[PDB]
Amino acid sequence: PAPEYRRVPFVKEDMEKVMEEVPEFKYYYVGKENTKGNVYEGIPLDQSILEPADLRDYVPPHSNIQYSKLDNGLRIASMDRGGLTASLGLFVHAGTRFEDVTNFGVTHMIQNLAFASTAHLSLLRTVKTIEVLGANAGCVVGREHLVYSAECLRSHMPLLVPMLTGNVLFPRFLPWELKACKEKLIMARKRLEHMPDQMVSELLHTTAWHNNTLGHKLHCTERSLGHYNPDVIRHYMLQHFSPENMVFVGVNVNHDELCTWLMRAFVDYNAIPPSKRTVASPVYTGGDVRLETPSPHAHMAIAFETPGGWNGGDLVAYSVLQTILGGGGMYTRLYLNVLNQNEWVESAMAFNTQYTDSGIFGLYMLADPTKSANAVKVMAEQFGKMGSVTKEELQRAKNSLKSSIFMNLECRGIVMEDVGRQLLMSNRVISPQEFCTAIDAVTEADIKRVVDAMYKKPPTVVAYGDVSTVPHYEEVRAALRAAGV
Amino acid sequence: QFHREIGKLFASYSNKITANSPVQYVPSPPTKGKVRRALSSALMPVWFKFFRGPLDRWNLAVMAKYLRDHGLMYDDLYSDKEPVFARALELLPPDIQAARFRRLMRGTYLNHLRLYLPVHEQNYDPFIPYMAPYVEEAKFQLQEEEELLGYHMWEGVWYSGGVTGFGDKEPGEHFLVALPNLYGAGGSPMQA
Amino acid sequence: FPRTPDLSKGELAAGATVTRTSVWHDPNEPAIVSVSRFAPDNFRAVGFA
Amino acid sequence: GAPKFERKMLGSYPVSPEFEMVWRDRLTAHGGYIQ
Amino acid sequence: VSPLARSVDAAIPEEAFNQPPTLTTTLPNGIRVATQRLPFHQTATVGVWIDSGSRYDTKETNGAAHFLEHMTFKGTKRRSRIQLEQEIENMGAHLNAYTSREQTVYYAKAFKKDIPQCVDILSDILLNSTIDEEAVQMEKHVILREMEEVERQTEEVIFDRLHTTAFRDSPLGYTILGPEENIRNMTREHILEYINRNYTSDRMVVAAAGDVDHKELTALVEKHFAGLPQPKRSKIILPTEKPFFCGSELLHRNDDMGPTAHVAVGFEGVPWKSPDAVTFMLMQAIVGSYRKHDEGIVPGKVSANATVRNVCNKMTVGCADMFSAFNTCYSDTGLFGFYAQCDEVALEHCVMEIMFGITSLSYAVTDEEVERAKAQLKTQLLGHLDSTTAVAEDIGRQMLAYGRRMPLAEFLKRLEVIDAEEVKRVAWKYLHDAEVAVAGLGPLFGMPQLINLRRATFWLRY
Amino acid sequence: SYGNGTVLMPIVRRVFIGALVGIYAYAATDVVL
Ligand SMILES: CCCCCCCCCCCCCCCCCC(=O)OC[C@H](COP(=O)([O-])OCC(O)COP(=O)([O-])OC[C@@H](COC(=O)CCCCCCCCCCCCCCCCC)OC(=O)CCCCCCCCCCCCCCCCC)OC(=O)CCCCCCCCCCCCCCCCC
């Protein structure tokens, strides 16, 4: 049941009349007309300076999501909560899972060239004008999506829209600007090495989906520098950056006004034309990888595949199981059965990483580098009992999950990212009220069913840090098989 | 508040310029007055025929013969000590940069010997503007920087960090910051 | 607002005359393709070769 | 100035010319102190 | 006549005026209740804001206020430690608390239906906690450990040392945790004395925000907070003495902890209710902040912020890993300054550049710089009022400081009429040629003299 | 312009020009006008 999109047609307008609607903006202050100074001098803050003309009777705003679409295929969705700071975001369905051996690193290059020179605005004037407006903006690359975002006072929205859309409409990709960005392109993975949690996650993906789809790396390598030229970049955008593969989202904006200015950004110039692409299905292989590094702890992670991912039909069941075990709390299964019964364990948790059509689920532990063999035995024992929960554990997990959902959605940023991410992966937005109804219908049999299916494929093992006593690949596999995994 | 009154005058003249600024290209107005554009057109047939005309033609012959004697192009005469032209040279592609390097080497050698090239090595047009696309892009880059960063006289710490404090960024280029060290072996700013 | 170059007469388009004019629009091409042909290395004066 | 084994610096920022004599006499605070 | 002179000039958006009101009531016993309803929410935050802290400890028992924080979660007469923890978990709610020098806070987050059960729990642990002598001795091991981890977060240690040297002659200089010897010799009688002298009805506010009803929150408070003692006065109406600001330095030299030094400098500021408090907020934003490993999309070398630009271009390589300005208000004084981290050989350059930027406020700041700072301040302040917790913290904090909540429109009206000539007036009065206090840690061989820092507060040009 | 410390020569330029305009204007009013 997809949402019904309202049509916003292209219209030709007189330029001089549209300029009467652009918000005021100043970069220079050549003198000042007002000469009254601080009229509130000497008045302390325990006393009010407002007048009756400043009082109003409150009228709540329109907080439901409204939907619209342009004629070029761009989908638009916005909501207003009455705040004064707006969040804006442009989501593109063009992540690292679409790269090949001749392209590895191109999506990371496009992220680091965000807000560079365009056909109607230079790099310096773009980043300098955003700062002077008091806004923050950036670009984030992922495995399935690329996102451009900005936050600013809600009266500056018309000024920020073109500086976001220009990156996908008419970037120039000048040689001397590419040569000035090549430095920050390598320092990413170098900065990633000294971040253990992020390194364990990367190793988990590269090992789960060997050389395909979700297993490609996020950042560039020294090899990638062999194809860092404008023609390769421009060829990638022509295959993936059409309006039909993009969604725009705003929070704390007027819906009708956002549609008008988005229509005006696309009316006079030609966008990248559509193209039919076939999405290859991921191939899960599992395996094992080690990475020795100076560290006082032995990091260890073990995971399995989740069939179907976000659209597999059992998303809510894996999120309830995660809550029972314990995530990033003092009555979770991992705090009572593992941490309290072993003083040499520094931490432990469960993770659940889901994508459009595949995901992984597993455990992650730090421990004393001299007891890695025992760390493997305890993890295997927990996997052996995952398919059994009591009524008290299950009921306490549901209540904890519902509260987290509603509480997360109090923040502007999270709401924006959730709405845009859902419309690219499923063309529908599931409300928190529908999540609750689904959470309440999870049974004990469902848990036991999804754990068994999870164990029908090989595992994915990762070790990081001091791995001097980590058993051999065959011994980890055998320990799991003795606990019934 | 005497500063706020002066600011009101600046602001009035500022708003007047803006309210009378066009929103599209409009040709610039003629500089010379009508009285001056009438005397010139009346004396033109005689002034141009016997003086200004031959002056223009002698000038281009003098320039062409000197450049061709040395194997040079007109655009080779500009210096890299101009900030605009320095930026333009940084934007050149390899093939054009190599040919300029070679012509400049050959012209210094010929001026040292004071020997003409043969006539058959002079058969070329020296007035082709091969630098123009790069000069106009350089002007655009540096006009942006000046308008966005250089619109005010900024203060700074004086005689600190190797610079004077009045705007210089490269160290040791003014006499009052000469001689940075008394002991040691010194160093290069390019190796920091 | 500078003057728009007339490409039919061979006029140069560079710098401010690319960024602040519509000289690069082409009805039968995407904008990202058209403006890729207006870098300074794309123009050469008659008589160069 | 100071001996070589005392002049060795912990940081990497370059010595500015107005501070040449300061760092020619660097001395390590063996044991530390509170001032 | 040009369209370039007919732009939409809307100073303060209409949304600032169309906000839901914050309702207030004072009960007979002196407790104050304040609420703002936000219909677009299903959860809520309710809490208790108290006007007490480490500044109200005695010199002999400095640390009881923080000690009391831990004991408040160890058991009551009707609920035990285990029973309390399980009741919160079974509702999916959260319960947090923190203690500072002048304010102490307890708050909970839960669904609407579970709000009454949260008010019952909050009143119980605040009025009926059993301070068992046997548990007081057990906590002594958990708190002595926290004193070692706090010694590992360097920024927190430096700000404590800055308070210690600046406010030598006042309880505002006490630390929150207290000395070790006081933690080892703590008894339940020291803690009960702190309670009976500080936790009264005239020093407590109950605030809520979300899907909340005011009349119902006023009746729950009247029922569960009835056993709260009222203030007793012995015919003593004597005023408190304003803390004295000592210009001094306290430096820990250590060449065996890496190449990075840490420093903080402070000026005497203004109190909450000052007519110049808004301007100090703005001056904090003009100096701003910077991180070398997180610049963003604007390179520091071309920033509009003059301080950032001068720091990043120093010796063509940059002289700071990070720095940030701060402004802190108290009941009868304040503290304004900056914190920074830097390389051993870069320390002198870094400190003197930031000092130069503060002293520029008195002489040469431009209206471009003021309006850039205004825009950033508005984006951050108005942006942080998204969740129910941040809003509730804003209600409670303002009820204690100002005696009221300031509407958003009033703040924006006061901020709008501050130009560059008003910044110059305030900085000339408070910051020009003033005393400074300094705290530092690490490899400090190249640290400036205190007198160098003191004379950098004025210029000899002009 | 932005980036260099040649800050006195632009002042010398404006003083010299002004001085010349005044010398040749004080002589014309004495000889011609
Ligand atoms: C304390 C002890 C007691 C005594 C103290 C005495 C006073 C001390 C302090 C005085 C004031 C200090 C602050 C100066 C202003 C700073 C403003 C600022 O932050 O802007 C930065 C600003 C850079 O701004 P920018 O936009 O980035 O670049 C500007 C462009 O370059 C060009 O931009 P433009 O083209 O738009 O042109 C702008 C121009 C527009 O205006 C005009 O063009 C108007 C022209 C008016 C002409 C008629 C009046 C005469 C003017 C002077 C004529 C030439 C004099 C030549 C003198 C040479 C010998 C010194 O603006 C000006 O002319 C303004 C400057 C006027 C001030 C000059 C006189 C006072 C300062 C003298 C230096 C300070 C002492 C240094 C001591 C060092 C010792 C180690 O820097 C300056 O303008 C600096 C000007 C001062 C000269 C630099 C230092 C010279 C050092 C060598 C001489 C040392 C002699 C020592 C022994 C003798 C005793 C001293």
Ligand SMILES: CCCCCCCCCCCCCCCCCC(=O)OC[C@H](COP(=O)([O-])OCC(O)COP(=O)([O-])OC[C@@H](COC(=O)CCCCCCCCCCCCCCCCC)OC(=O)CCCCCCCCCCCCCCCCC)OC(=O)CCCCCCCCCCCCCCCCC
């Ligand atoms: C027939 C007999 C005739 C004899 C007449 C000769 C003339 C006699 C002059 C008497 C002057 C007495 C007053 C002294 C005050 C000096 C200025 C001051 O307050 O410095 C503060 C200055 C900065 O203070 P701060 O506490 O660091 O910072 C506070 C603010 O935050 C900083 O805020 P800010 O950033 O806005 O300030 C930056 C600071 C700039 O700070 C700097 O970057 C360093 C400034 C340079 C040092 C101060 C100037 C004095 C140095 C003495 C050089 C003498 C050379 C002798 C050669 C003789 C050859 C025969 O600004 C300035 O002070 C700019 C300079 C002001 C314009 C020029 C007027 C002062 C010049 C005084 C005389 C020097 C020239 C005489 C040359 C003689 C040649 C024949 O202090 C220092 O730099 C510390 C050391 C200063 C030593 C002072 C020594 C004074 C001796 C003067 C007598 C000259 C000897 C003449 C011999 C003649 C034999 C024939």
Ligand SMILES: CCCCCCCCCCCCCCCCCC(=O)OC[C@H](COP(=O)([O-])OCC(O)COP(=O)([O-])OC[C@@H](COC(=O)CCCCCCCCCCCCCCCCC)OC(=O)CCCCCCCCCCCCCCCCC)OC(=O)CCCCCCCCCCCCCCCCC
């Ligand atoms: C070192 C290694 C080797 C081993 C060790 C060696 C050891 C020995 C070395 C020395 C150690 C001791 C330290 C010595 C320090 C000396 C001071 C120093 O270094 O200052 C440099 C300092 C430059 O410092 P900087 O760091 O390179 O740059 C400063 C800024 O940051 C940036 O500024 P900027 O770059 O934008 O522009 C700078 C420019 C700025 O240029 C100007 O402002 C112009 C200066 C020259 C003006 C006069 C030239 C002619 C102009 C046409 C006529 C005008 C007439 C007047 C009317 C004008 C309209 C009202 O300056 C120059 O071009 C430099 C000129 C050199 C001047 C040196 C004179 C020193 C004082 C002694 C004078 C003695 C005169 C005797 C002859 C006359 C006898 C009757 O120079 C000055 O700014 C001082 C200018 C002084 C001008 C005096 C002019 C006197 C004559 C006027 C004409 C009178 C005609 C009357 C006719 C009557 C007929 C009856």
Ligand SMILES: [Zn+2]
């Ligand atoms: Zn604590």
